[PDB]
Amino acid sequence: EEYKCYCTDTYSDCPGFCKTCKAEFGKYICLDLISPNDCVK
């Protein structure tokens, strides 16, 4: 929106976009902070 922003979507494995994958409750969680444009949605 108005900053680097941080990806926090959940996954079943560490995504190449979020090398820092957090497997919790069985799924994953991105903890990255970057925004070359603003948001992918």
Binding site: Y3, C7, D9, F17, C30
Partner: peptide, 11 residues
Amino acid sequence: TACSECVCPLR
């Protein structure tokens, strides 16, 4: 190609 769930509430 960040994730579809980008969080950026409050600059």
